[PDB]
Amino acid sequence: DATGKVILICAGDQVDDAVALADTLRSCRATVVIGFRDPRALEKASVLLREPRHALAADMYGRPTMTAEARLVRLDPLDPRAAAQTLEQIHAELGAIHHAVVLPGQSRHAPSASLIEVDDQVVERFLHQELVGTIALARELARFWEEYPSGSSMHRVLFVSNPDDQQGNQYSHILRAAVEQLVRVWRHESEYDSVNPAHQQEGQSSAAVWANQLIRYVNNEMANLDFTCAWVAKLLGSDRRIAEINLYLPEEIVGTIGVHNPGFGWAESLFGLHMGKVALITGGSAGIGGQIGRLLALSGAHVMLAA
Amino acid sequence: GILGMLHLQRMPTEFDVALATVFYLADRNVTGETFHPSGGLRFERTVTEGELFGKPGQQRLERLKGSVVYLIGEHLRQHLVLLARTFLDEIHVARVVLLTETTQAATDLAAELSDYEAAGRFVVIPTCGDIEGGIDRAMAEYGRPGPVISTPFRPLPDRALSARNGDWSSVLTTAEFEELVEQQITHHFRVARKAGLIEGANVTLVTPPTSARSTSEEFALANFVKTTLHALTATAGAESERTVPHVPVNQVDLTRRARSEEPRTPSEEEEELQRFVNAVLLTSAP
Amino acid sequence: RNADQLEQMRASIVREVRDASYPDAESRVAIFPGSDVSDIDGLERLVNHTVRVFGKVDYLINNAGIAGAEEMVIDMPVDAWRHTLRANLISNYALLRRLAPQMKAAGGAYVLNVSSYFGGEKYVAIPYPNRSDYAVSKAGQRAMVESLARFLGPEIQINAIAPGPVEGGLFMRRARLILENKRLNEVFAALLAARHEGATIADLLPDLFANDIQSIANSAAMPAPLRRLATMLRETSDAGGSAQSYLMNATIARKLLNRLENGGYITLHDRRALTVEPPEPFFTEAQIEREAIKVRDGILGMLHLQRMPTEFDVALATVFYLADRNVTGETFHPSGGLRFERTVTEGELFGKPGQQRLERLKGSVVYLIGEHLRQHLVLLARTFLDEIHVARVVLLTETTQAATDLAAELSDYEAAGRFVVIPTCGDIEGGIDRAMAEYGRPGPVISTPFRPLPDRALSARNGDWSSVLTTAEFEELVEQQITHHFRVARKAGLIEGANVTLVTPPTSARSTSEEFALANFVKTTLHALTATAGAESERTVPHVPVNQVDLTRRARSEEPRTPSEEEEELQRFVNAVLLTSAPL
């Protein structure tokens, strides 16, 4: 549930993944603010979002919702005094922001999957705009939360990693190692500083932070971009405090637990109702009877279709 | 024409009705009721259950003098013999036609109605299960059907006299149910269809068996036959006004849904019979 | 209405939802201490508080309930009936009207009117004796739905719920009540029988309230029926109760006297308290237990599955029903299936005055009211006097101007006292008492309403909410079209030989569509009222058959065609009235 909550997705040039995350979060009846790191990507995102595929919000039952549309802003993490200005601007526009899904800078950090062949030409961009960039954004957000204390639940900052195409993801590994600690050390400091009267007197009472990671570079399938959406939307819109920092997808989705959820919550609600019963259906090949047989088999009973 | 009778102005799809049915299947506390998975339609109902108090209208009484009336049936012997007596004495009908599906009952009814033998109005013919042929001969004899009097040749089978038991040996089986459907539902359709074919042959279906809750596995039996005849007249009634031929179809039932209804009073059912003779002389034709 | 119970149930529900993994901040739930529902003007504060704490309203559940004083119609005071109707029926439309203008802009609106299956069902007004208000106010809660579903529009949905007997009090209070009513019954029958043959209560009241059955039997200076009743009590009744020696009690004494007062049997200044107070054990517990078993078994014998549902099942069924987005104006049955002895509306059952039947009520007194349909009343008077030759006709009128208009309209039946008129000024009790005092005691009373339909619109979208039927009009409509019938029927209930015949207005000609819903409301509510009243009037020693007659949907069916052709309805009205007014 995210009705009264605002989710700002700290996206980058990843139009497809960020827009998919925006759709899966707006399916939880929540307004979104999609900020893109690099320029020349805002207009492509606007064109893609103009289409009704991503311009309409439907919840997990398949019912459309009149939730607020997807806003679009420009953010420059590596460049201070402008990201903070945009943060205060979106403050004035909407109010405080607490849910911040932080995605990396670029899709593929390097064109070649190697670390020693290079001679400081692209790894400088990596180490300067995707590690430091993340650190700058983390403080940009921390200041917004502490400079402006807001009494509510703990602050949530997911740290979704990039997907895998080929040759694994050596850079994803690096960012993951830097993230786990940033989340760990932060969570601790935050929780310790939530009770100190010294920092409490600054304005009003503030709230702590609880962050995680959602590693995806191990699963190479077709539903890893829908499993990731499920895990990002479950750790934000619910009250579930993971005691572990890094989370990892299964090497095989259908292999361990194959579940397909095209917004089919009715069939999930109709689970184990009529279990261990045999049913005889007449003309259950096409029409109402076929659908009754479908929902009864999904319920758990035994069916015998005759036409 | 459709979608204009819907309050929400939205037609449901198969998924909604299937989901509602599947969710209703797990109630485990309901029985003998009709569910409505998705419906808010506006057709209301042109036909509703009614009753009758008697006192037939004098204006709509003398208009049937010098006419021809067709009646079928043999199981309700006294009902028919009195019917003929009333039709000839007070109604002063010109011609009365009686249909019989066997010869022994034909002779018995001839002996019963020999009081009108000199007049020659009553006619008994040994028909058979080919009711279409019988009525065709009946109308080929003279005239055409008018106030068609519908009456089952035999009462409801209830041969096993059980809708359920504990040993499952003396219960109404599939063959007896098929016979009941063919004789108490399909027979009425056959007679009415023929009555409709003859314009002005207004057909009045009747439910003779006044089974009561006192008769187990028989009261609801009377209830079902009534409901089925209701369904039959309801749709038929719609097609009779728009179409050129004018054949109003009426259904009159005496097996009231009043549990035991009348008690077991010997020689004190002549009032209920008189109520019936009133019901049959009403409706039909003026 | 209470605070501690609400606090405890909120604690339990908030714990349950916290275990349900929702982003709860104790904001999903709220309380309103002292939110009594019988006062209408105080609901606006509740609505404002709701729209302030939350913002709007989307689901409205009208589940406020009042069992009622739990007596027979002929016993009820008017104030209890008004309280029951206000806390049970009007409180639904009050909130509905207060929330509809904002509800229209939402689009996901739903109104649920929780009713009781004993209230009734569509086209069958099932009886429910001794709980008349709880049947009328539960039939109204679905009549509103059936009449308003079409006009509410697509954005708002509206249905009802009818759960029957639901349980996983033992009817002890019910057992005591049925025993006491039995007492009021044989005592009332005794005096009636005594006064039926050359006797008066005047000389029968002084020794009556001595509650000494031995003295009553030994003295023999009193009419026989009370003596035989005393002997039957001496023989049959249990010996382990005060009843074995005493007759009345602190309750069945005042109530019975009031019955006689209301019925006109006993005049004023004839009321006194009990000289002797019977001891505490008036009724042997064994009798209470036996009546409890009997009631229970009679209630439980109607189930097809031979078991009763629990609140959880009906709550689950209602909650699952709330998610349907294609159903409007239909009554659901969350857990039902029962055997009933009900009645079905005939819909203009065919019938005419049969010869050799008439002239039974010749030289008698007939009763009628009304001021709205003047021509109808004068037509009735003409048809009552030309053929029947009625000895006395009483037509009470709401206002004096209409009385003068009626007097000028007739102007030919005077100089004999047959055509007698009288003002009412909205006080039916005063007019009926004057009729019982100076005029005779007519049997066939007719509950013809004094005033016409509200004649206003009730369908509109957001931004236009001025001409709509508001709660004040609705209360006036309920008071004049439902409560008026109850008042007339109840006050005329305690009459020997009464033939009460409720009549609902046949609306008018060239009618709009909006006012074709209040008619259905009145139809259903009066159907439930007359069904319950007729069921009660059968056991009750005196039998006053109530028969409801309406001329709506009679060849009209919302089809506008009325060029002349009035004689059809002119003759149909008299045919129906004379037919229902003459039993046997």
* Cβ-defined contacts of C198-206 (< 8 Å, 24+): C199/C223, C201/C260, C201/C265, C201/C266, C201/C270, C202/C270, C205/C266, C205/C270
Structure-token match 């959406």, residue found: A229
> Does residue C168 contact residue C153 with C-beta atoms inside 8 Å?
no
Look at residues A282, A301, A291, C163 and name the one whose alpha carbon lies nearest to residue B26: A301
For the beta carbon of residue A269, count every other beta carbon within 10 angstroms.
13
In angstroms, the CA A211 to CA A156 distance is 5
| Nearest-Cα residue of chain C relative to residue A234 | C21
Annotated catalytic residue within C117, C128, C134, C439: C134
Active-site residue C138, yes or no? yes
Q: Label the pairing between strands C59-62 and A64-65.
A: unpaired
Q: Is C321 a catalytic residue?
A: no
Q: How far apart are alpha carbons C273 and C210 in whole angstroms?
A: 10
Q: Are B52 and B278 in contact (CB under 8 A)?
A: yes
Whether the Cβ atoms of residue C499 and residue C441 lie closer than 8 Å to each other: no
CA separation, residue A23 to residues A302, B210, C30 (Å): 37, 67, 33
C25 neighbourhood in chain A, CB within 8 Å: 153
Contact call for residues B77 and B100 (beta carbons, < 8 A): no
Interface-testing mutation among B19, B22, B27, B38, with chain A (most A C-beta atoms within 10 A): B22
CA distance B25 to B16: 14
Q: Is position C255 annotated in a ligand binding site?
A: no
CA nearest C282: which of C210, C187, C211, C185? C211
Asked whether the beta carbons of B140 and B109 are under 8 A apart, the reply is no
Q: Single out the catalytic residue among C110, C128, C138, C439.
A: C138
- E strands, chain B, are 68-72, 95-100, 124-126, 148-149, 203-207, 250-253
Residues A180-190 as b/e (b if ≥16 CB within 10 A, e otherwise) read bebbeebbeeb
Q: For chain B, first and last CA: distance in Å?
A: 35
Consecutive H or E run containing C420: strand C419-423
Q: Do C23 and A238 touch (CB under 8 A)?
A: yes
Distance, CA of B258 to CA of B268 (rounded, Å)? 18
Residue C383: both structure tokens together: 């048809």
Give the separation between CA C536 and CA C50, rounded to whole angstroms.
42
- Between chains, do C23 and A240 touch, taking CB under 8 Å as contact? no
Residue A260, SS3? Answer: coil
Task: Please check whether residue B29 is in contact with residue C335, taking contact to mean a CB–CB distance below 8 angstroms.
Answer: yes
Chain C nearest C-alpha distance from A149 (Å): 18
Question: Is B54's Cβ below 8 Å from some Cβ in C?
Answer: yes
**Contact assignment for A295 to B17 by CB distance below 8 Å:** no
* C114 within 8 A of C160, measured Cβ to Cβ: yes
Q: Inter-chain contact B52–C154, Cβ cutoff 8 Å?
A: no
- The distance of Cα B21 from the centroid of its chain, to the nearest Å, equals 33
Cα separation of C503 and C505, whole Å?
A: 7
Residues from chain C that touch B10, judged by Cβ atoms under 8 A, are: 154, 326
DSSP label at A286?
S
Cβ(A31)–Cβ(A93) below 8 Å: no
Q: Say how far apart CA C537 and CA C531 lie, in whole Å.
A: 10
Say yes or no: C22 contacts chain A, CB-CB below 8 A. Answer: yes
Copy the structure tokens of residue B162: 């059980």
- Beta-carbon pairs below 8 A across chains A and C: 15
Angle C165-C528-C109 (CA atoms, 0-180°, nearest 5)? 75
C523 and C551 Cβ atoms separated by less than 8 Å? no
3 state SS for B68-112: EEEEECCCCHHHHHHHHHHHHHCCCCCEEEEEECCHHHHHHHHHH
- Cβ neighbours of A301 in B, within 8 Å: none
Cβ–Cβ under 8 Å, residues C165 and C308:
yes
Q: Which bin fits B199, alpha (ψ -120 to 50), beta or left (φ > 0)?
A: beta
For residue A94, which of A171, A25, A4 has the smallest C-alpha distance?
A4
First to last CA, chain C: 51
Q: At B53, phi and psi to the nearest 5? A: -105, -20
Residues A36, A9: Cα–Cα separation, whole Å: 9
Task: Report the candidate in C204, C114, C244 with the shortest Cα–Cα distance to residue C166.
Answer: C114
Nearest CA distance, B14 vs chain A (angstrom): 6
- Taking the C-alpha atoms of residue C382 and residue B189, their distance in angstroms, rounded to an integer, is 49
Distance CA C203, CA C208 (A): 9
Q: Are C366 and C340 in contact (CB under 8 A)?
A: no
Structure tokens at C127: 């009886």
Residue C422: its H or E element: strand C419-423
Q: Answer whether C431 touches B (CB < 8 Å).
A: no
Biggest alpha carbon–alpha carbon distance for chain C: 85
Q: Subunits touching A (CB < 8 Å, at least 3 pairs)? A: B, C
Residue that has been written with the tokens 């572990």 in this structure = A244
Q: Helix C78-85 to helix C484-491 angle, to the nearest 10 degrees?
A: 150
In angstroms, rounded to a whole number, what is the distance separating the alpha carbons of residues C81 and A114?
88
C-alpha–C-alpha distance, residues B208 and B276, integer Å: 9
Contact C503, C446 (CB under 8 A): yes
Which of B40, B49, B52 is the closest to C327 by Cβ? B40
According to DSSP, residue C465 is labeled: -
Looking at the complex, does the CB of residue C58 fall below 8 Å from at least one CB of chain A?
no
Residues from chain A contacting residue B26 (CB–CB below 8 Å): 273-274
Distance CA(C243)–CA(A80), nearest Å, equals: 96
Are the CB atoms for B52 and C351 separated by under 8 Å? yes
Residue recorded with tokens 């895998």:
A164
Select the residue from C148, C305, C312, C326 to test the B interface by mutation, using most B Cβ atoms within 10 A. C326
State the pairing for strand pair A278-282/A246-248. Answer: unpaired
For residues C385 and C574, give the distance between their C-alpha atoms in angstroms, rounded to a whole number. Answer: 13
Q: Give the SS3 label for residue A57.
A: strand
Give yes or no for A58 touching B (CB within 8 A). Answer: no
Q: Which tokens is C556 given?
A: 């009209």
- Give which of C201, C207, C85, C196 is closest to C135, Cα–Cα: C85
Contacts of A275 (CB under 8 A, 6+ apart): A299, A300, A301
Q: Tell me the HSE value of C24 on the side-chain side, using a 13 A CA sphere.
A: 15
C360 contacts: CB under 8 Å, gap ≥ 6: C582, C584
Locate B50 and state its tokens. 């009614």
Strands A99-102 and A6-10: parallel
User: What distance in Å separates the CA atoms of residue B251 and residue B258, rounded to the nearest whole number?
Assistant: 18
**Is C353 within 8 Å of B55 (Cβ atoms)?**
yes
What is the least distance, in Å, from the CA of C180 to any CA of chain B?
30
CATH number of the domain at A2, please: 3.40.50.720
Residue B33 and residue C337: Cβ atoms within 8 Å? Answer: yes
List chain C residues with CB under 8 Å of B213: none
What does DSSP assign to residue B170? S
Partners of A230 in beta bridges = none
The two tokens of residue A161 are 């990693």
Write out the DSSP string of C26-48: S-S----TT--SS-STTHHHHHH
Overall residue count recorded for chain B in this entry: 286
How many CB atoms within 10 Å of residue B203? 27
Half-sphere exposure for C63 (CA within 13 Å, toward CB): 9
Q: Which residues contact B203 (CB under 8 A, 6 or more apart)?
A: B148, B150, B191, B192, B195, B196, B247, B249
Instruction: Give yes or no for A271 touching B (CB within 8 A).
Output: no
What single-letter DSSP state applies at residue C356? T
Which residues of chain B make contact with C345, given a CB cutoff of 8 A? 48-49
The beta-carbon neighbor of B14 closest among A273, A274, A291 is: A291
Asked if residue C420 belongs to a known ligand binding site, the reply is: no
Q: Is A288 labelled as part of a ligand binding site?
A: yes
Cα separation, C469 vs A276, in Å, equals 55
For A259, how many CA atoms within 13 A lie in the half-sphere containing its CB? 12
Q: Which chain A residues have a beta carbon less than 8 Å from that of B15?
A: 291
SS3 sequence of A101-169: EECCCCCCCCCCCCCCCCCCCCHHHHHHHHHHHHHHHHHHHHHHHHHCCCCCCCEEECCCCCCCCCCCC
Q: How many CB atoms lie within 10 A of CB C101?
A: 15
Q: Are strands A64-65 and A57-58 parallel, antiparallel or unpaired?
A: antiparallel
**C23 and chain A: CB distance < 8 Å anywhere?**
yes
Closest CA of chain A from B59, distance in Å: 53
Looking at the complex, does the CB of residue C327 fall below 8 Å from at least one CB of chain B?
yes
**Is the Cβ of C309 closer than 8 Å to some Cβ of chain B?**
yes
CB contact under 8 A, C326 and B55: no
Cβ-Cβ contacts under 8 Å, B12 against chain A = none
Non-local (6+) Cβ contacts of B10 within 8 A are C154, C326
User: How many whole angstroms separate alpha carbon C140 and alpha carbon B37?
Assistant: 24
- Closest among C176, C139, C72, C125 to C343, alpha carbons compared: C125
Asked if A288 reaches chain B (Cβ–Cβ under 8 Å), the answer is: yes
CB-based contact (8 Å) between A269 and chain C? Answer: no
Query: A84 — phi, psi (to 5°)?
Result: -65, -40
Residue C196 to residues A260, C192, C266, Cα–Cα distance (Å): 84, 6, 14
Query: C326: nearest CA in chain B?
Result: B38
Contacts of B37 (CB under 8 A, 6+ apart): B12, B16, B17, B20, B21, B24, C324
Asked if C428 and C349 touch (Cβ cutoff 8 Å), the reply is no
Residue C2 among known ligand-binding residues: yes
As given in the structure block, the two tokens for residue C245 are 């020696």
CA distance A106 to A163: 11
Q: Which of C479, C520, C529 is nearest to C500 (CA)?
A: C529
A299/B17 CB distance under 8 A? no
| Beta bridge mates, C421 | C395
- Cβ-defined contact of B19 to A294 (cutoff 8 Å): no
Give me the phi and psi of B253, to 5 degrees please. Answer: -125, 140
- Verify whether the Cβ–Cβ distance A288 to B18 is below 8 Å: yes
Q: Give yes or no for a contact between C499 and C583, defined as CB atoms under 8 angstroms apart.
A: yes
**DSSP of C70-109:** -S-GGG--HHHHHHHHIIIIIHHHHHHHHHHHHHHTTS-E
User: Would strands A209-211 and A278-282 be described as parallel, antiparallel, or unpaired?
Assistant: unpaired
Identify the burial level of C14 via C-beta atoms within 10 angstroms of its C-beta, where 0-12 means exposed, 13-18 middle and 19 or more buried: middle
In sign, the C-alpha dihedral spanning B31, B36, B42, B47 is: negative
Phi-psi map region of C24: left, alpha, beta (phi>0 left; psi -120 to 50 alpha):
beta
Domain span at A13: 1-256
Task: Look at residue A200 and give its three-state secondary structure.
Answer: helix
Go through chain C and tell me how many residues it has. Answer: 584
Kindly report the number of other CB atoms within 10 A of residue B283's CB atom. Answer: 18
d(CA C307, CA C301): 9
Q: Name the residue among C27, C103, C91 with its Cα closest to residue C61.
A: C91
Is residue C504 helix, strand or coil?
coil
Query: Residue C93 class from Cβ within 10 Å (0-12 exposed, 13-18 middle, 19+ buried)?
Result: buried
Residue of A nearest to B19 (CA): A295
Judged by a CB distance cut-off of 8 A, whether residue A210 touches chain C is no
- Cβ of C123 within 8 Å of Cβ of B49? The answer is yes
Task: Give the DSSP letter string of C330-350.
Answer: -EE-SS--B-----B--SS-B
Q: CA-CA distances (angstroms) from residue A282 to B33, C54, C347, C537?
A: 21, 50, 39, 51
Strand C156-161 versus strand C392-397 pairing type: unpaired
- CB < 8 Å to B19, chain A: 266, 270, 295
